[PDB]
Design a protein around this ligand. Sequence first.
Ligand SMILES: NC(=O)C1=CN([C@@H]2O[C@H](COP(=O)(O)OP(=O)(O)OC[C@H]3O[C@@H](n4cnc5c(N)ncnc54)[C@H](OP(=O)(O)O)[C@@H]3O)[C@@H](O)[C@H]2O)C=CC1
Ligand SMILES: NC(=O)C1=CN([C@@H]2O[C@H](COP(=O)(O)OP(=O)(O)OC[C@H]3O[C@@H](n4cnc5c(N)ncnc54)[C@H](OP(=O)(O)O)[C@@H]3O)[C@@H](O)[C@H]2O)C=CC1
Lengths: 359, 359
Amino acid sequence: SYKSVALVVGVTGIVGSSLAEVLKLPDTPGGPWKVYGVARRPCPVWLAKKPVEYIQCDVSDNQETISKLSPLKDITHIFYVSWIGSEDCQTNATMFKNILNSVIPNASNLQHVCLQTGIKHYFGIFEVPHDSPFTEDLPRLNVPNFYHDLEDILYEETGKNNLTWSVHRPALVFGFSPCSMMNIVSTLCVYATICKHENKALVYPGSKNSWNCYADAVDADLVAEHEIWAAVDPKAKNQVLNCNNGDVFKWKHIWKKLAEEFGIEMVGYVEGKEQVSLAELMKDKDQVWDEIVKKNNLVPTKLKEIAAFWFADIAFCSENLISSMNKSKELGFLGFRNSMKSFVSCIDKMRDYRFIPAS
Amino acid sequence: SYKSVALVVGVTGIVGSSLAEVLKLPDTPGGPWKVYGVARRPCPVWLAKKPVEYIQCDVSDNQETISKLSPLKDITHIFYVSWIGSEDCQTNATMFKNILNSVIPNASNLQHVCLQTGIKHYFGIFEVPHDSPFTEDLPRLNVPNFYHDLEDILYEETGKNNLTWSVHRPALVFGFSPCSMMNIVSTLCVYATICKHENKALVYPGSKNSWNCYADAVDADLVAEHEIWAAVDPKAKNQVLNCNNGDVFKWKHIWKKLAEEFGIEMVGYVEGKEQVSLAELMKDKDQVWDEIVKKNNLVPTKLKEIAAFWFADIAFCSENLISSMNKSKELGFLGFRNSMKSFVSCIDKMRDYRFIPAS
Ligand SMILES: NC(=O)C1=CN([C@@H]2O[C@H](COP(=O)(O)OP(=O)(O)OC[C@H]3O[C@@H](n4cnc5c(N)ncnc54)[C@H](OP(=O)(O)O)[C@@H]3O)[C@@H](O)[C@H]2O)C=CC1
Ligand SMILES: NC(=O)C1=CN([C@@H]2O[C@H](COP(=O)(O)OP(=O)(O)OC[C@H]3O[C@@H](n4cnc5c(N)ncnc54)[C@H](OP(=O)(O)O)[C@@H]3O)[C@@H](O)[C@H]2O)C=CC1
């Protein structure tokens, strides 16, 4: 007997994996929560030791989704925290439609759908941005951003079925999942771990501007708390909401912290030196990674899975992307984190869980 | 019969005038509060209609301070929210010493001294800065900053007399006092009011960087709340604490808002155009101001009193001065304001109080 029943679509992801932890805490709003977690891969080892009912399901395949999710009649809240690995508006849209079409007719006590998008809503796509600080009310850019498609489906389907909705636009996520397609902290920890292995310094590859500019981020657990808040507090219902840690930082200070955490020398940004691609620097390091994995008895991960060096490249030529938390705060959500501390905490947790070497 | 008795040194100032309002609210921590307000000028009209016992006193004159403050035996908390009008370490230090030397021996139930300094602690003096975001633990710069003198006296005097202390470092203050030596909002409202009068556009005089960079500020009432918090909550005692609104903004967006609030056309920053001095643009506008005052039946103010065009000049060549609120938040203070809204609210309040024209 449970109070609430969550479907977490993307349970292996950087946010879904936090939700799987946060939803099972005793103090969590709306608890006690039962948790169904969906992902495409077979349940990895680390997740089998969690109290989540894992449903292995390719949610881009409609018949499969119907057969796997239509029996789930007790669901009360959906948390869509997934995307396919690309910016295809059509294929991302299919996943979300298949979730709703499979669950809405079958779960008579469904109440709410949380959709997670992101701050790209304000400045465009990875394939003429608004100025910042970004606020929720800013109109859509004239670009094929799959976030637009997902919102439209969200509004259409919740409205005709008398369900409430929320849209969450997190900033860059600080999290611990080694299964994510965009995990900045594990990406940078892997780079550091490789530098250390090869007796090299932690050399910063990015732009001058990304070194020196203000940046913001969100801890995965805070995103989970923010999503859980919008799912249970009537004041938050049917709102588009940004989600960040509530402060700002600079990569320059994070880089120092990173070097210290791995006990290696740092080479910061060098005046006049231009961005180099971390993707290229790490192009054929997969066997090095495989060695470090076996050597340290880590959870086995492939280099391309734990790390997204392409994504660090983007973070390191980005600037002026700060988002505002005023709306959420004026609605009464006062969750926050110290971003420097959240970063270190992600490092610790990935060591703790044995995704990366201790010490 | 009162619970707490506040001495507000600088009661006509941009923060002291907020404290005079905030301390008299029924829900205010530590209330009901009795309020003594000190300033050098005779009580201006607007302040005579407030329930504060006004003590006219030149606090740089020791005998005068002794005779005026030594009878005040019931004081429990001092809020030092004043400075002389300059950066002289010696003359600022005299004021603060004279307050403590006159009150500490005479008020046996004295508990706490709040000292207000500022973010200049981190980057130097108006007459080689730390990088930001500024955190409280950053060491002193090797400069003659009178803030250093005030802290040293604060620590010395509170320690030997078994009193608790706090140091508050607000960001740029958004407030309503027409008696302040550094009131950015009234300064900009005056400029706007003059543009409107002379049928000119609201032309931005500042630098490119100050137009485009992230900036932060603090609402006066929030500073008062922050100071009151540190004065009554044991968790906050004997701490140095930054104070800002909890978000960031850009002058570019504020400028638009300012133009709208005065119904005049805006001319924003123009690429390649260099900073001009607002002090010089307004050099002999005092009779214009005098006219606008009589014409609109405003509280009578001299141009040099309501406005500090020199100070807007500094704000408009400044950048990279963001301060962190993480410490305060981790101690449990979750007060905040929307800076865009706080700015507008200062405008409204100055109209409300008749310091500047309505509409
Ligand atoms: N820093 C970040 O990571 C940020 C992300 N966002 C946004 O948040 C949203 C969710 O992304 P994020 O949390 O990063 O996701 P992750 O890449 O960490 O996780 C993706 C999840 O979706 C699952 N998934 C992918 N394709 C399928 C499929 N066909 N069927 C079933 N499950 C699938 C994955 O499991 P499996 O591996 O088995 O396929 C995985 O569990 C995206 O819109 C993203 O842009 C926004 C801001 C920041
Ligand atoms: N934006 C801002 O204004 C910021 C200010 N700060 C800092 O806060 C501190 C306090 O300043 P702020 O609140 O701006 O002050 P204001 O200039 O608004 O107020 C000064 C107050 O002190 C009184 N005062 C000045 N000299 C004397 C004297 N000899 N005897 C008695 N009273 C006196 C003034 O009254 P009277 O007019 O009668 O002399 C007035 O009430 C300063 O260190 C300042 O740097 C920090 C960050 C931002």
